[PDB]
Amino acid sequence: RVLPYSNGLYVINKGDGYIRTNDKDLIGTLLIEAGSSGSIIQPRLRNTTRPLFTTSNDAKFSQQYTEERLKDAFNVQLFNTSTSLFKFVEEAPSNKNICIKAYNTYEKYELIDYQNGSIVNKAEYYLPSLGYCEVTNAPSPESEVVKTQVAEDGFIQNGPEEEIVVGVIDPSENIQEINTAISDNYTYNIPGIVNNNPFYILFTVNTTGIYKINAQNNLPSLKIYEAIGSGNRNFQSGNLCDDDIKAINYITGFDSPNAKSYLVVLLNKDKNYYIRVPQTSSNIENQIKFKREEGDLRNLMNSSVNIIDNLNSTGAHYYTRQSPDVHDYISYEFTIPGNFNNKDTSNIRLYTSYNQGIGTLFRVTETIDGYNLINIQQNLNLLNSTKSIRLLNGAIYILKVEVTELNNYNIKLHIDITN
Amino acid sequence: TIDLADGNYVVSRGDGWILSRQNQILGGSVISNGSTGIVGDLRVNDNAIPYYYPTPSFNEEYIKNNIQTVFANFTEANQIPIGFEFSKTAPSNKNLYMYLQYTYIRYEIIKVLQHEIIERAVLYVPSLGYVKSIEFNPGEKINKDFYFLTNDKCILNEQFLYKKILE
Amino acid sequence: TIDLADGNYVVSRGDGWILSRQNQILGGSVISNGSTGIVGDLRVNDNAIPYYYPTPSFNEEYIKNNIQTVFANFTEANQIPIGFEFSKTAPSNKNLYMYLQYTYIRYEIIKVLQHEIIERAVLYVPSLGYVKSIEFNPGEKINKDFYFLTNDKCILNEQFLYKKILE
The missing domain is CATH 2.60.120.1090 (Jelly Rolls)
Structure with missing residues (x-):
């Protein structure tokens, strides 16, 4: 319930097989006379499909944007067009009739600004999926009819329980990159163009190990993030390659303004990492020192070392x-x-x-x-x-x-x- | 005489409705001696047509709008084609006849006054279909009931799903 | 550290590759109680897109040209549509979930120097697909591994088919 998450952007996959209440999404029921068989087909004669989308903020979390975040998170290609198709088929036993009904479905994505203990913004993106079908015994047509009031608008999940979260690069925070892989030491100057705003540093390392990373005077406080699935695919010895991944996984680091800290993290040669320098504020020039630590300090591995002077x-x-x-x-x-x-x-x-x-x-x-x-x-x-x-x-x-x-x-x- | 507060209600009866006299319009196939027949359909904008039975006070528009706000929005949905088909295999002694009939959802909208229904308009929007098989020797007389639906009905069980139309 | 003469090689790893995070993009269908589900796909020029991960010295063109000279020429081939589909029937006690994922061929091209690989560019050109079934009662927690491929992999066995790039 605590849900610690180092504040920022997260897109979650809250599951498949969602449908809307009151059969807003039923394709139709067809009824199969005992000993026949019958299917319902979505052939994709026509590609177009409709996703459903709702957001706390249009201005920040616009459908276009909340679409792009799914690209960032899962490299989702298509949003309202599938060429992938589905059908459901059933045979009835020879004793009794059967009847199969079919609903369109959605995967349900959640997009979240989780700043500092609470979700400050949220969009729900219902991505058109590939079906749900119920098979039941044919109902007796004489069965009595219950005057029954419709339900509040909403959703039912028929797919299995799922919630899988993926951090994403904040598109409003710039990305700067270190082309050369970090070896044993390396000192990085915050460029001009970042203008004391927050931004990200992409880099890699040559030989895998424990590194102390701080800023000038252990201030500001930093976070480091592994990029998911990095470093299969392309690589050039000594340098980094882009890999094409803005889905990220928090390793460690504080979100606090003006706390003094240095990071001590394990880093693997076959992965790419982003660092997130926060708003600088100060007009002085700062620097990010990467040092490879071969000493006792490995004991602090994957920790952020907080400073109390x-x-x-x-x-x-x-x-x-x-x-x-x-x-x-x-x-x-x-x-x-x-x-x-x-x-x-x-x-x-x-x-x-x-x-x-x-x-x-x-x-x-x-x-x-x-x-x-x-x-x-x-x-x-x-x-x-x-x-x-x-x-x-x-x-x-x-x-x-x-x-x-x-x-x-x-x-x-x-x-x-x-x- | 139905137990509701005075006013207008929007109502879904079942999927699975079929209409008087309309069995056999689409044709039917006859298959013999343990071969298998498969009839089926699609849905451009013929199957797509909904049938409106409006009343004074419940004009076409009123009906359309009011049930699309609550239920399955059809004008949107029946632009993308959807298919359905059935596969009946015949016995080996004799041969059989199967014909296709379109099923519909029955929406209706109702004025209630005094726990009584004074007025009802009706919309049939097309869902999928339904086939009826029958085995026959030639000369064998068939029940007229088999080829002729004399009054609209639901081939599934009905229902009565409702919402008050607001003020 | 691989036993080859200094130089550039063109390489086919398997058919049957699948990509990090990309399970479920296409959607998935959920089917219940011994009915049967059939999901499948086609291939206009979406499925058709190949994914390039180039390096300095191995630009997109270089890659494309060089593997189309040795192997399956794709730009030509993925203009004619080809289909594929899968048909999973559910048990009768409980219900199940199946989702579609595109498979790819993994081509890569490699600079070797000193019986060591100094550089590698990679191309994933799409082959067909793959579906994953799973049976579930509602509430039953599922393994996160089932819905999330965390690092690219081949669902078939890999291979390493190679040719030296000539001078």
């Missing part, structure tokens, strides 16, 4: 962020208030108010090569945790949280410091 000497602190889904990770790099005596300590309890998680605590040492995570505490159970630890003043630590039970869209982490 700002602890008060003592007191309660909290940090609310979009919660990851069960068995995914959010991480937290925090440095503890006070100068580094190497004997001084501050007492640190790490709670979480709403969802359960397995917390993993590390001390961070940094060398010219990269971070080094020394292992402090494992298996920590966060949800309203009584527990505390003495950590070293001025030292730097990282908490890696695996979500175990997901009870709320946001994960609120507390750092309550005592002395």
